[PDB]
Each structure stands twice: as C-alpha cells, then as structure tokens.
Amino acid sequence: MIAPMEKLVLAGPKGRAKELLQSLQQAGVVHLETLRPEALSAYQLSPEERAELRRWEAVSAGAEHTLSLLGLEAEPARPFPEGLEAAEKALSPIQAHAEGLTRQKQELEEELALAQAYLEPLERLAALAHGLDKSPFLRVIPFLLTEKELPLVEEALRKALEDRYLLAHEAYAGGVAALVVVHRKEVDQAKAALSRAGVAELRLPGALGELPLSEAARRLKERAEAAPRELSEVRQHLAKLARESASTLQSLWTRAQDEVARLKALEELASGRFGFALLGYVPVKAKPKVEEALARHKESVVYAFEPVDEHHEADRIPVVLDNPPWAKPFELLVSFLNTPKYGTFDPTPVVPVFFPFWFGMIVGDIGYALLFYLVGRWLSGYVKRNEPLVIDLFALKLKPQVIGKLVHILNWMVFWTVVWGVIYGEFFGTFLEHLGVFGTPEHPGLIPILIHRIDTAKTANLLILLSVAFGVVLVFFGLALRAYLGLKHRHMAHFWEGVGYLGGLVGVLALAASYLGNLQAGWLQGLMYLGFGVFLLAVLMSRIWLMIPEIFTQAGHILSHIRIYAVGAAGGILAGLLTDVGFALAERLGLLGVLLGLLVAGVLHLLILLLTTLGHMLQPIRLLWVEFFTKFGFYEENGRPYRPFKSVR
Amino acid sequence: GGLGLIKSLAEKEKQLLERLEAAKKEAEERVKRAEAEAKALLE
C-alpha cells in the first residue's frame, strides 16, 4: 500500500546542517525538497565549496574514465575515507599510466595494421629499385593498382618517352605495384596523365611514405618485428595494472560518489544566514532510524517529523509499494508500469492472485512444468553463484535480487501450474499414448481426469464459462475499486462512472443470458431494464457524453477473458498433436523408432514450446494490465517517485 | 511546515543580528571612550 511519506522539517547551523546532511545521507531514507522561496535564501553555500565539489566530481569522472580505459566497470562497494588531494594522488598516477599504455597500444596496433598491407609491396618495389631510390635524376612513382590492365596505365607511358617511362609491375601479384619511372618533372606530368587514366601512388603514412623506399621497407620490417611483442607486453601491463588498481579505484570512486552526492544534496538545501532549513519526505516504517539519526545532531538541533498530506492533493510527495513478502516478488512487474496517486489503489496483489492461476490453465503440460523446474534450478544455481545475471547475447545485466524475485515468482507460478496441469491431466504432451495415467471414459486405463482437454462437447463450454466468470469478476472488481477510489478521493464523477459502468455491464450480461442465452426471460427482464435505467441515470447524473463506446470497451475487456481459454486449448491441442504424431511414428511405426522418434518429437516439442509459451505467458499479464489497470484508471499523473539519499555502497 | 522553517530560521537570524547590532553599538562606545580619554590626556 501507499506509505505515509511523512515530512521532515529541520533547522540547524550551516556546518551543523552539513553534518546532518552527511548523517541523513548515511541514513539515506528520505527524499529531499527545496522549498527555497518561502522567506529564505537559496543556499548558494560557497563558490569555494562549489569549486571543491567540481574538483571531486572531476575526480569521480576521471575514476570512471580510468575504470573504462582499464576495462573495469562501475562496481559499487564500500567507500575509501581519505582526503581529496590523497584521492587525486591515488587516482591520477594509475590513470596516467593506463592512459599512456592505452595510447601506446593503440599506436602499436595502428602501426601493425598499416604494416600488414605494404610490407611485401614496398620491399618488392625497393628490391626492383635497389639503386634507383633517391638519386637526383628521376622519380619512380609506384602505384598499387589492380590486376593486368597494365597497358591501360601504360598508354600514358607510351605517350611519354620511348626507351624509358618504365611503367610495369615486376612483383606483388595481389596488388600490382606498377612502378612508373620516366623523369622528375616529366614523370610528374606523366603521373598526372596516369591519374587522368586513373592511378594513385603509394603515399603511405608515418615514415613509409615520408622517407626513401629502402629505409621505408626497413622501418616497416622493424615495426612488424616490434609490434607483436610490444602489443603483448602492453596488454599484459594493462591487465596487471587493472588487476592491481581496480579495487582501489572502485573504493575511491565510491567515496567520491558519496561526497559528490553529499555536495549535490547540500546544493538543494535552504540556508538562513548562519542557519539552515531542511525539508524531506520519509516513510513511516523508518521513523525510528530517522529519529535516531536526528538525535545524532549537535544537540539534536531543532527538527520535527511532521505528517504528510491526505488523499487530496499530494503531488510532489512520493509513495511506496509496501507489499508482504509473499507478494513482494511481483513488485518489479508492478513497477514496469507507472505509480499511484498516493490514494490510488495498489493492484499489485492481483498479479500474484490471478496470473499464475491463469498461466497454469494456459500451460497444462507437466513436462513443460518439469522443464520450468529445471530452469528454475539453473537460475537458483546462478543466484547461488551470486554473479550478475549477465548475458552478452541479450546484452542483459540484471541484479541478483531481480533473479531471486524471478525465481520466487517462478516457484509460485509453477505450484499453480502443476496444480492446474494435474487438473488438466497432461504431462509432456501425452505420455498417455504409452501410459494412460489420466483415465478417460473412452479409454479407461487408470485414475480419471477432471477435463480430458481433447474433448470439447462439454469441456469447452464449461471452460469458456469459467474463463468468462473469472474475467467478469475481475471487471467487477476493477469497477468497484474505481468507485471506491472515487469515493475515497471525494470524486463523485469517478464513483458515478464506475457505478454506471457496473450497472450497464450487469444489464448487458443479463440481457445476453436472457435473449441469447438460456430461457426464462421474466425474472431478468426487470434486471435488464434496471441495468439500462442505471446506465441512463448515471449518464444523466454525469452529463459527460460518455457514450456507448465506453460500454462497448468495457464489454470487450470483459470478453477478452476467453482468449486465455483459447490460448490454453490451443497450446494443449498443439502439444497433443505433436505427441500424437511422435507416438504414431514411433510406436505405431513398428515400436523400433521409439527412441529416435521420441527424440525428434521432443526436439520439435521443445522448439514449439519455446516459440509459443513466451507469448502464451505474456498474454495473461498483458490482458491483466489491459483490464484491471484501465478499469481502475492507472494512467493519471503516473505518481511521484521515491528517491532518498543513496549511500550507494 | 514551511512557515515553521521560516519561524525557526527567523529565531536564529534575529538573535544573531541582535548580536551583530550589539557588536556595532559596542564598537561605537569604544570610539567614544577612546576619543574622550585621548582629548583629556592631551589637555
């Protein structure tokens, strides 16, 4: 339920409020409040404090960037209480060492990548040009061109001198190093002519395209021989530096984040000229620790824990879930949506009340339940390993508390799933082709089943009736909660709207079961007339022109409950057809392909279960969020968020 | 309440501003005493 979130007023000195802010950040269980304009200053405390906070924030950003360059991640742990100068001295040394090592490793990798392409070509060009490199007669433009279209480039060389303008490729058969040697200026004009024919000389980077080709190939072979050992040494040094300094950087960044959060929270204070005001909101379940922290002031400097506002107009005040531990695990799926208006109803119990009972009616396969039990054992072993739920495939990093809540929800769902699957009387599709443990009236072999789930002459009508009954009960619960919240918030429009929607739905269901359903339309004729009159009376008392579309939308939300029975029967029919085809082509085909046919049928059934059960389990919670939330509103102002001080640890 | 913050800050700031105006009246009486004894000493 929505907690109190009661207010907390406090008055202190400037430095005493700094101490009390450090206390209330260590006791970080109260969201803050500015309240600056009410006859006080804005607590622009000090530009020296602003500069020290900027220095600590730069230290924290440098610690984050140093963990990033070292490869470490933002792993929260206990802080390191030390001076800011000592923190800078600890941080900047390893940060500078890692930055220099990373720059050297990137430069060595770029040098190796550049040397991997022009090692053999520059060496071949220098080998052909072993005496003609830099003597001041003629340039030799080597162009790394394509395969043997050497006459298309040599057209310009034939336009040049006869027994010279040697434009050919002696070696480097992959990328043909077409050396063209004519002159200096005449070969520059011929290089312009070859570029007009389409050409590009080997203007390499570094010292390769900035020195003579013999020294270029020599430095290329030298860098090629030096790059691998230097890159491996840089990788080993980076790994050793990260493994040696990651814990110190993490503790330093934790203390830096703590002090920076203290500075940013003290920025949101209210100072009173060597006095200071403080305003917060904290839940009722932590009032004792708040009073114990407030007693730890200078002389318990004058504060008060005052009450929060009522159901009317609590806008900036946040709320909380506050569920029991048997129902606490659905709080994540509850918080996937928005928050309530601190007086709006918490429908989080309806999730654990209705979603597993619907999912067990959907998933009646006890082999799928055993696979879910094995997957829950795997998730329980992963949570016992206490690692982060890390999947680089999905790029999903989830907390271990999230995995534990998911495992608890999976166990609570698997209980009702096994219950309704034994009520369905089906296991792994159908092992009943071999071992008919669920007895049928058509095939009496063992103890009976409640619903055979392959029969539909009576089971389908009863299943549709039970699903429609559960859905109409949930719709009536949503309309009743809407009218109750309209009465509790003193909003008679919402209460009259819920009453009129309930009366219209009751009259519509009565008229349906009278005219289109069974006989004896006399006892319910006045009931349908009363439902129509109640809808018309609430329309007249509302006068909001809430037309027939709202009633038809409520009718569709009620009728959506048969989709659960449809999905359960569809999954059951698919699993029964798959198990029947496997049993036929395994046992009825000689009973010798029992193992191979059973394995192929199990692979196909696992693929079909992975393809279908995700959407099948998704549609229950989707229909629940579509029906119960929208019948209760749940899209009005989205609540206010509870954000106390961190003490991130 | 926020008026409660206004009140409990007005308490402190008016007592401290009373101490500041006491300090400046004190300094004015220091000026009076110094000039009186200095002129009597010169005479």
XYZ file of C-alpha atoms in Angstrom:
692
model
C 0.000 0.000 0.000
C 0.985 3.654 -0.324
C 3.109 4.589 2.679
C 2.857 7.807 4.699
C 5.924 9.579 3.210
C 5.689 11.997 6.127
C 7.502 15.308 6.038
C 10.601 16.261 7.998
C 11.417 19.861 8.908
C 14.828 20.717 10.314
C 16.738 23.802 11.417
C 20.457 23.931 12.091
C 23.589 25.982 11.526
C 25.451 25.949 8.214
C 28.143 23.441 9.188
C 25.759 21.625 11.509
C 23.433 21.164 8.531
C 26.432 19.868 6.583
C 26.948 17.310 9.364
C 23.226 16.490 9.470
C 23.220 16.153 5.676
C 26.117 13.706 5.953
C 24.061 11.866 8.586
C 20.843 11.854 6.519
C 22.867 10.708 3.506
C 24.372 7.931 5.609
C 20.780 7.423 6.767
C 19.570 7.839 3.203
C 15.882 7.074 3.697
C 14.334 10.475 2.940
C 13.678 12.147 -0.394
C 14.553 15.829 -0.417
C 12.644 19.077 -1.001
C 13.922 22.514 -1.997
C 11.343 24.964 -0.507
C 13.718 27.855 -1.200
C 11.348 30.760 -1.922
C 9.499 30.826 1.417
C 11.209 33.789 3.149
C 14.721 32.298 2.939
C 17.820 32.193 0.768
C 18.567 29.667 -1.980
C 21.558 28.125 -0.095
C 24.183 29.118 -2.616
C 26.631 27.981 0.060
C 30.116 28.803 -1.182
C 31.888 29.152 -4.527
C 34.856 27.557 -2.754
C 32.573 24.652 -1.858
C 31.368 24.706 -5.476
C 34.979 24.515 -6.680
C 35.789 21.671 -4.279
C 32.643 19.859 -5.435
C 33.671 20.420 -9.059
C 37.116 19.024 -8.226
C 35.608 15.961 -6.534
C 33.208 15.499 -9.463
C 36.117 15.719 -11.899
C 37.930 13.152 -9.743
C 34.896 10.854 -9.919
C 34.594 11.331 -13.688
C 38.301 10.594 -14.020
C 37.875 7.475 -11.889
C 35.026 6.346 -14.151
C 37.081 7.055 -17.283
C 40.075 5.282 -15.724
C 37.955 2.220 -14.978
C 36.718 2.424 -18.579
C 40.243 2.656 -20.011
C 41.390 -0.100 -17.640
C 38.388 -2.182 -18.699
C 36.760 -2.145 -15.260
C 33.072 -1.459 -14.649
C 31.194 0.683 -12.131
C 31.019 -1.923 -9.372
C 29.628 -0.446 -6.137
C 31.376 -1.309 -2.889
C 32.353 0.281 0.424
C 33.967 3.737 0.215
C 37.534 4.779 0.971
C 37.606 7.610 3.561
C 40.555 9.760 2.510
C 41.486 13.288 1.541
C 40.639 14.786 -1.829
C 44.310 15.515 -2.505
C 45.153 11.954 -1.453
C 42.352 10.676 -3.692
C 43.733 12.697 -6.610
C 47.259 11.414 -5.932
C 45.986 7.830 -5.834
C 43.846 8.256 -8.952
C 45.996 10.306 -11.358
C 49.085 8.036 -11.223
C 47.371 4.835 -12.315
C 45.114 6.840 -14.647
C 48.119 8.413 -16.377
C 49.908 5.050 -16.586
C 46.835 3.380 -18.096
C 46.241 6.288 -20.499
C 49.831 6.172 -21.732
C 49.704 2.385 -22.063
C 46.395 2.593 -23.947
C 47.734 5.263 -26.309
C 50.886 3.195 -26.892
C 48.830 0.046 -27.518
C 46.521 1.862 -29.948
C 49.530 3.322 -31.778
C 51.223 -0.091 -31.945
C 48.023 -1.707 -33.235
C 47.648 1.015 -35.875
C 51.300 0.548 -36.870
C 50.824 -3.225 -37.155
C 47.648 -2.757 -39.209
C 49.427 -0.303 -41.514
C 52.454 -2.603 -41.824
C 50.338 -5.683 -42.594
C 49.428 -4.293 -46.042
C 52.515 -2.603 -47.529
C 55.302 -4.789 -46.120
C 55.812 -7.041 -49.158
C 54.915 -4.357 -51.727
C 57.343 -1.688 -50.502
C 60.058 -4.330 -50.109
C 59.429 -5.587 -53.658
C 59.489 -2.037 -55.047
C 62.730 -1.315 -53.180
C 64.188 -4.616 -54.407
C 63.429 -3.773 -58.040
C 64.574 -0.187 -57.338
C 67.718 -1.245 -55.418
C 69.815 1.537 -56.974
C 67.124 3.982 -58.129
C 65.542 5.390 -54.969
C 66.659 8.965 -54.225
C 69.437 9.874 -56.649
C 68.514 13.242 -58.213
C 67.668 12.138 -61.745
C 64.196 10.594 -61.866
C 61.311 9.809 -59.561
C 59.781 6.323 -59.512
C 56.051 6.547 -58.782
C 54.872 3.115 -57.607
C 51.096 2.836 -57.855
C 49.398 -0.054 -56.068
C 46.932 -0.871 -58.840
C 44.725 -3.810 -59.855
C 45.478 -6.882 -61.990
C 46.924 -6.965 -65.503
C 45.365 -3.888 -67.096
C 48.945 -2.548 -67.192
C 48.529 -1.350 -70.795
C 45.654 0.923 -69.731
C 48.103 2.678 -67.412
C 50.981 2.283 -69.899
C 49.096 4.272 -72.553
C 50.372 7.417 -70.822
C 53.864 5.890 -70.641
C 53.711 5.237 -74.387
C 52.647 8.874 -74.682
C 55.876 9.531 -72.741
C 59.442 8.622 -73.763
C 60.257 5.523 -75.789
C 63.131 3.630 -74.113
C 62.024 4.925 -70.699
C 58.851 5.759 -68.750
C 59.082 2.211 -67.442
C 55.578 1.649 -66.049
C 55.286 -2.003 -65.065
C 54.740 -4.378 -62.143
C 57.564 -6.856 -61.577
C 56.124 -8.461 -58.433
C 53.342 -8.161 -55.803
C 50.789 -10.113 -57.823
C 47.968 -9.306 -55.386
C 48.240 -5.538 -55.538
C 50.352 -4.770 -58.595
C 52.995 -2.204 -57.632
C 53.113 -0.524 -61.029
C 56.321 1.475 -60.809
C 56.482 4.260 -63.397
C 59.922 5.835 -63.843
C 60.459 8.493 -66.513
C 61.950 11.689 -65.065
C 61.202 14.078 -62.223
C 59.083 16.779 -63.883
C 58.138 14.783 -66.983
C 57.223 11.857 -64.736
C 55.184 14.254 -62.585
C 53.269 15.227 -65.731
C 53.022 11.527 -66.615
C 51.691 10.816 -63.117
C 49.061 13.484 -63.744
C 48.307 11.722 -67.045
C 48.063 8.355 -65.281
C 45.728 9.880 -62.689
C 43.697 11.138 -65.648
C 43.712 7.497 -66.740
C 43.076 6.613 -63.079
C 46.014 5.942 -60.754
C 47.216 6.556 -57.200
C 50.800 6.354 -55.973
C 51.761 4.710 -52.678
C 51.733 7.796 -50.451
C 51.957 5.894 -47.176
C 51.758 7.334 -43.653
C 54.400 7.684 -40.945
C 57.937 7.142 -42.209
C 56.956 4.767 -45.027
C 55.599 7.485 -47.301
C 57.979 10.101 -45.914
C 61.428 8.529 -46.433
C 63.337 6.619 -49.131
C 61.806 3.275 -50.038
C 64.734 1.209 -48.728
C 64.535 2.899 -45.322
C 60.732 2.705 -45.606
C 60.791 -1.079 -46.035
C 63.471 -1.356 -43.330
C 61.355 0.584 -40.825
C 58.321 -1.428 -41.973
C 60.064 -4.728 -41.208
C 61.362 -3.265 -37.927
C 57.883 -2.177 -36.821
C 56.479 -5.533 -37.973
C 59.042 -7.342 -35.822
C 58.467 -4.989 -32.873
C 54.650 -4.679 -32.918
C 53.618 -8.125 -31.614
C 55.903 -8.275 -28.567
C 55.164 -4.650 -27.656
C 51.412 -5.194 -28.053
C 51.525 -8.329 -25.890
C 53.599 -6.522 -23.252
C 51.178 -3.580 -23.316
C 48.218 -5.947 -22.916
C 49.936 -7.736 -20.019
C 50.837 -4.418 -18.373
C 47.274 -3.125 -18.788
C 45.852 -6.337 -17.310
C 48.298 -6.215 -14.385
C 47.592 -2.521 -13.734
C 43.824 -3.081 -13.863
C 44.042 -6.136 -11.587
C 46.230 -4.202 -9.137
C 44.342 -0.892 -9.043
C 40.686 -1.738 -9.768
C 39.729 -2.243 -6.109
C 41.432 0.990 -5.039
C 39.813 2.873 -7.928
C 36.432 1.364 -7.015
C 36.696 2.368 -3.348
C 37.946 5.825 -4.356
C 35.109 6.284 -6.858
C 32.634 5.063 -4.231
C 33.824 7.647 -1.702
C 33.913 10.265 -4.470
C 30.329 9.460 -5.476
C 29.324 9.655 -1.802
C 30.935 13.077 -1.341
C 29.589 14.332 -4.686
C 26.089 13.185 -3.745
C 26.524 14.996 -0.420
C 27.559 18.147 -2.297
C 24.673 17.893 -4.778
C 22.220 17.332 -1.922
C 23.614 20.275 0.055
C 23.129 22.306 -3.123
C 19.400 21.549 -2.766
C 19.321 22.868 0.817
C 17.883 26.109 2.230
C 20.272 28.356 4.167
C 19.202 31.046 6.608
C 22.269 33.297 7.148
C 24.275 31.075 9.547
C 21.151 28.983 9.854
C 19.778 26.344 7.563
C 16.424 24.755 6.786
C 15.838 21.189 5.638
C 12.701 19.574 4.226
C 12.327 15.891 3.425
C 9.851 13.058 2.975
C 10.439 9.677 4.619
C 8.159 6.643 5.125
C 6.520 5.727 8.411
C 8.407 2.411 8.548
C 11.737 4.251 9.011
C 10.711 6.964 11.507
C 12.724 5.294 14.295
C 16.032 5.269 12.406
C 15.269 8.833 11.291
C 14.764 9.895 14.917
C 17.966 8.071 15.890
C 19.872 9.917 13.158
C 18.285 13.239 14.162
C 19.343 12.610 17.767
C 22.947 12.447 16.477
C 22.993 16.198 15.695
C 24.883 18.846 17.694
C 22.235 18.917 20.434
C 19.522 17.314 18.328
C 19.371 20.655 16.530
C 15.788 21.672 16.213
C 13.828 19.419 13.845
C 10.421 17.740 13.636
C 8.841 14.745 11.895
C 5.519 16.156 10.706
C 2.698 14.436 8.816
C 2.285 14.173 5.056
C -0.774 15.416 3.162
C -4.012 13.493 2.677
C -5.535 11.733 -0.337
C -6.460 15.145 -1.748
C -3.507 16.922 -3.405
C -0.309 15.055 -2.549
C 1.537 15.770 -5.796
C 5.231 16.267 -5.040
C 5.029 13.718 -2.205
C 6.038 10.215 -3.370
C 4.607 6.805 -2.484
C 5.827 3.242 -1.929
C 4.696 -0.283 -2.757
C 4.869 -1.832 0.763
C 3.738 -5.367 -0.038
C 4.014 -8.525 2.083
C 6.947 -10.892 1.470
C 4.573 -13.477 -0.012
C 3.586 -10.826 -2.586
C 6.786 -8.725 -2.756
C 8.131 -10.589 -5.823
C 5.582 -9.078 -8.246
C 6.727 -5.536 -7.411
C 9.070 -5.498 -10.425
C 6.268 -6.252 -12.889
C 4.151 -3.729 -10.978
C 6.888 -1.086 -11.333
C 7.128 -1.810 -15.056
C 4.062 0.455 -15.181
C 3.634 3.875 -13.540
C 2.962 4.757 -9.892
C -0.252 5.511 -7.976
C -1.583 8.838 -6.734
C -0.999 8.050 -3.001
C -4.635 7.176 -2.530
C -4.978 5.283 -5.765
C -5.363 1.564 -5.171
C -2.351 -0.739 -5.302
C -3.420 -3.557 -7.645
C -0.121 -5.395 -7.188
C -1.798 -8.258 -5.240
C -3.999 -9.095 -8.242
C -0.887 -10.092 -10.242
C 0.108 -12.920 -7.863
C -3.598 -13.571 -7.265
C -4.568 -14.164 -10.895
C -1.576 -14.525 -13.238
C -0.284 -17.928 -12.019
C -3.794 -19.413 -11.882
C -4.369 -18.261 -15.461
C -0.922 -19.417 -16.614
C -1.461 -22.888 -15.172
C -4.715 -23.139 -17.097
C -2.726 -21.977 -20.123
C 0.289 -24.238 -19.550
C -1.136 -27.617 -18.584
C 1.931 -29.539 -19.761
C 3.692 -31.121 -16.790
C 6.730 -31.821 -18.957
C 6.881 -28.093 -19.641
C 6.482 -27.666 -15.880
C 9.427 -30.020 -15.310
C 11.479 -28.032 -17.822
C 10.480 -24.906 -15.893
C 11.592 -26.629 -12.679
C 14.950 -27.470 -14.268
C 15.317 -23.881 -15.499
C 14.445 -22.685 -12.000
C 17.125 -24.980 -10.598
C 19.578 -23.469 -13.102
C 18.571 -19.931 -12.102
C 18.808 -20.914 -8.425
C 22.322 -22.212 -9.041
C 23.182 -18.974 -10.836
C 21.838 -16.973 -7.884
C 23.753 -19.254 -5.510
C 26.820 -18.335 -7.543
C 25.634 -14.733 -6.836
C 27.052 -13.474 -10.117
C 25.326 -10.685 -12.035
C 22.791 -12.084 -14.470
C 24.991 -11.295 -17.457
C 24.056 -12.338 -20.988
C 26.188 -10.810 -23.733
C 23.746 -12.320 -26.238
C 20.781 -10.285 -24.989
C 23.183 -7.628 -23.583
C 21.261 -8.077 -20.332
C 22.833 -7.264 -16.963
C 20.363 -7.963 -14.159
C 20.811 -7.842 -10.404
C 20.805 -10.994 -8.262
C 17.795 -9.663 -6.339
C 15.893 -9.457 -9.635
C 16.858 -13.063 -10.397
C 15.786 -14.117 -6.902
C 12.412 -12.404 -7.261
C 12.053 -14.053 -10.676
C 12.892 -17.446 -9.154
C 10.345 -16.909 -6.369
C 7.712 -15.867 -8.919
C 8.648 -18.925 -10.992
C 8.193 -21.225 -7.985
C 4.850 -19.645 -7.061
C 3.759 -19.880 -10.700
C 4.992 -23.470 -11.024
C 2.961 -24.532 -7.978
C -0.332 -23.378 -9.518
C 0.921 -24.563 -12.918
C 1.430 -28.120 -11.655
C -1.938 -27.841 -9.873
C -3.879 -26.842 -12.988
C -1.871 -29.217 -15.189
C -2.803 -32.145 -12.976
C -6.304 -30.675 -13.172
C -5.720 -30.747 -16.927
C -4.190 -34.219 -16.575
C -1.426 -33.822 -19.160
C 2.339 -34.364 -18.973
C 4.992 -33.644 -21.653
C 2.307 -33.510 -24.288
C 0.938 -37.030 -23.940
C 2.746 -39.939 -22.361
C -0.822 -41.278 -22.084
C -0.391 -42.902 -25.506
C 2.009 -45.251 -23.721
C 0.990 -44.843 -20.053
C -2.590 -43.581 -19.851
C -2.400 -42.364 -16.259
C -5.267 -39.888 -16.745
C -8.258 -42.168 -17.229
C -10.810 -41.311 -19.874
C -14.356 -42.646 -20.266
C -13.422 -43.586 -23.830
C -10.158 -45.263 -22.739
C -10.348 -46.420 -19.117
C -6.814 -47.378 -18.132
C -6.062 -45.619 -14.846
C -7.338 -42.920 -12.460
C -9.601 -40.357 -14.146
C -9.010 -36.789 -15.260
C -11.228 -33.804 -14.496
C -11.018 -32.431 -18.045
C -9.655 -34.679 -20.783
C -8.743 -31.476 -22.741
C -9.072 -33.293 -26.098
C -12.850 -33.294 -25.688
C -14.915 -30.180 -26.335
C -18.612 -31.176 -26.351
C -18.904 -30.162 -22.687
C -15.388 -29.186 -21.587
C -15.137 -26.242 -23.987
C -18.435 -24.657 -22.914
C -17.533 -25.093 -19.241
C -14.039 -23.701 -19.868
C -15.476 -20.660 -21.667
C -17.981 -20.180 -18.836
C -15.281 -20.378 -16.143
C -12.963 -18.008 -18.026
C -15.818 -15.549 -18.626
C -16.775 -15.792 -14.941
C -13.213 -15.004 -13.822
C -12.996 -12.125 -16.301
C -16.364 -10.645 -15.331
C -15.390 -10.959 -11.665
C -12.131 -9.130 -12.378
C -14.023 -6.459 -14.335
C -16.491 -6.024 -11.472
C -13.524 -5.806 -9.087
C -11.951 -3.107 -11.253
C -15.173 -1.095 -11.450
C -15.698 -1.486 -7.690
C -12.147 -0.323 -6.981
C -12.721 2.622 -9.341
C -15.900 3.622 -7.499
C -14.177 3.091 -4.132
C -11.269 5.315 -5.176
C -13.705 7.943 -6.443
C -15.450 7.840 -3.072
C -12.151 7.940 -1.158
C -10.789 10.846 -3.219
C -14.202 12.616 -2.908
C -14.551 12.467 -6.712
C -18.213 11.617 -7.298
C -17.662 11.651 -11.074
C -15.414 8.577 -10.876
C -17.760 6.823 -8.435
C -20.814 7.570 -10.594
C -18.876 6.423 -13.676
C -17.888 3.134 -12.040
C -21.451 2.601 -10.805
C -22.884 3.295 -14.258
C -20.347 1.032 -15.959
C -21.159 -1.751 -13.481
C -24.905 -1.291 -13.986
C -24.562 -1.266 -17.763
C -22.358 -4.369 -17.695
C -24.817 -6.168 -15.404
C -27.779 -5.249 -17.612
C -25.860 -6.275 -20.735
C -24.861 -9.662 -19.296
C -28.421 -10.232 -18.051
C -29.930 -9.338 -21.437
C -27.357 -11.557 -23.184
C -28.067 -14.592 -20.992
C -31.821 -13.939 -21.290
C -32.328 -13.305 -25.011
C -29.338 -15.155 -26.483
C -28.562 -17.476 -23.571
C -30.983 -19.729 -21.712
C -34.762 -19.446 -21.293
C -36.915 -17.843 -18.535
C -36.508 -14.187 -19.501
C -39.089 -12.983 -16.963
C -37.092 -12.765 -13.742
C -34.277 -10.969 -15.593
C -36.405 -8.643 -17.752
C -36.698 -6.203 -14.865
C -32.985 -6.780 -14.266
C -32.068 -5.748 -17.822
C -34.464 -2.801 -17.549
C -32.790 -1.844 -14.259
C -29.337 -2.070 -15.836
C -30.403 0.150 -18.738
C -32.049 2.585 -16.325
C -28.952 2.655 -14.118
C -26.761 3.395 -17.143
C -29.145 6.157 -18.264
C -29.376 7.567 -14.727
C -25.601 7.689 -14.311
C -25.355 9.277 -17.765
C -27.850 11.945 -16.690
C -26.089 12.454 -13.343
C -22.752 12.628 -15.196
C -23.743 14.527 -18.398
C -20.218 13.946 -19.741
C -21.387 12.269 -23.004
C -19.565 9.066 -22.032
C -21.107 7.305 -24.992
C -21.760 3.654 -25.935
C -18.065 3.306 -26.913
C -17.052 3.185 -23.232
C -19.629 0.470 -22.523
C -18.504 -1.485 -25.589
C -14.875 -1.136 -24.476
C -15.802 -2.460 -21.029
C -17.682 -5.302 -22.739
C -14.629 -6.122 -24.845
C -12.386 -6.027 -21.778
C -14.770 -8.470 -20.100
C -14.984 -10.718 -23.175
C -11.176 -10.762 -23.541
C -11.034 -13.431 -20.801
C -11.995 -16.173 -23.277
C -8.663 -15.598 -25.043
C -6.975 -17.236 -22.039
C -9.055 -20.386 -22.535
C -8.396 -20.158 -26.280
C -4.625 -19.946 -25.756
C -4.636 -22.789 -23.230
C -6.686 -25.041 -25.505
C -4.504 -24.084 -28.485
C -1.293 -24.954 -26.653
C -2.885 -28.176 -25.449
C -4.060 -29.086 -28.954
C -0.610 -28.341 -30.390
C 1.175 -30.399 -27.724
C -1.327 -33.234 -28.100
C -0.943 -33.244 -31.881
C 2.857 -33.233 -31.574
C 2.821 -36.044 -29.009
C 0.305 -37.979 -31.119
C 2.464 -37.678 -34.246
C 5.526 -38.722 -32.251
C 3.738 -41.670 -30.636
C 2.309 -42.749 -34.006
C 5.569 -42.526 -35.964
C 7.479 -44.080 -33.024
C 5.323 -46.879 -31.552
C 2.753 -47.320 -34.332
C 5.666 -47.350 -36.799
C 6.987 -50.675 -35.579
C 7.827 -49.589 -31.990
C 11.514 -49.623 -33.017
C 11.878 -45.908 -33.716
C 10.627 -45.180 -30.204
C 13.913 -43.596 -29.110
C 14.724 -41.757 -32.355
C 11.129 -40.677 -32.936
C 10.839 -39.694 -29.274
C 13.994 -37.582 -29.583
C 12.794 -35.877 -32.777
C 9.363 -35.288 -31.221
C 10.985 -33.897 -28.079
C 13.154 -31.541 -30.130
C 10.117 -30.347 -32.099
C 8.090 -30.007 -28.885
C 10.872 -28.002 -27.230
C 11.065 -25.726 -30.280
C 7.277 -25.292 -30.315
C 7.215 -24.632 -26.561
C 9.966 -22.019 -26.880
C 8.075 -20.461 -29.795
C 4.632 -20.436 -28.143
C 4.863 -20.370 -24.329
C 6.577 -16.959 -24.281
C 3.610 -15.260 -25.936
C 1.223 -17.543 -24.045
C 2.578 -16.411 -20.667
C 2.879 -12.839 -21.934
C -0.782 -12.569 -22.952
C -2.071 -13.220 -19.381
C -0.125 -10.370 -17.792
C -0.823 -8.205 -20.851
C -4.568 -8.803 -20.567
C -4.327 -8.213 -16.809
C -2.581 -4.868 -17.310
C -5.050 -4.016 -20.078
C -8.116 -4.880 -17.987
C -7.508 -4.308 -14.270
C -5.343 -1.192 -14.558
C -7.549 0.557 -17.127
C -10.700 -0.374 -15.200
C -9.026 1.255 -12.187
C -7.641 4.144 -14.229
C -3.895 3.797 -13.514
C -2.895 6.321 -16.215
C -3.472 9.512 -14.209
C -0.382 11.611 -13.293
C 1.854 8.458 -13.023
C 2.602 9.071 -9.319
C 5.634 10.697 -7.735
C 8.907 8.780 -7.354
C 10.570 7.826 -4.090
C 14.206 8.948 -4.324
C 16.015 9.131 -0.976
C 19.707 9.762 -0.442
C 21.835 6.979 -1.850
C 24.807 5.858 0.284
C 25.305 3.548 -2.661
C 27.786 1.092 -1.028
C 5.537 23.267 7.924
C 7.447 25.704 5.735
C 6.235 28.580 7.879
C 7.722 26.525 10.712
C 11.034 26.629 8.857
C 10.572 30.399 8.410
C 9.914 30.775 12.154
C 12.784 28.591 13.359
C 15.168 30.370 10.967
C 13.851 33.822 11.930
C 14.638 32.919 15.554
C 18.318 32.270 14.786
C 18.757 35.158 12.368
C 17.162 37.711 14.692
C 19.241 36.584 17.682
C 22.422 36.691 15.576
C 21.513 40.087 14.078
C 20.847 41.309 17.617
C 24.383 40.143 18.443
C 25.707 41.978 15.374
C 23.979 45.262 16.255
C 25.188 44.799 19.835
C 28.697 44.410 18.384
C 28.452 47.648 16.415
C 26.990 49.667 19.327
C 29.838 48.192 21.384
C 32.389 49.420 18.822
C 30.746 52.872 18.820
C 31.125 53.094 22.600
C 34.779 52.045 22.153
C 35.157 55.022 19.780
C 33.535 57.349 22.344
C 35.746 56.144 25.211
C 38.945 56.340 23.156
C 38.301 59.894 21.941
C 37.269 61.112 25.420
C 40.353 59.752 27.178
C 42.651 60.907 24.345
C 41.412 64.514 24.471
C 41.608 64.551 28.282
C 45.158 63.171 28.009
C 46.253 65.848 25.511
C 44.813 68.650 27.670
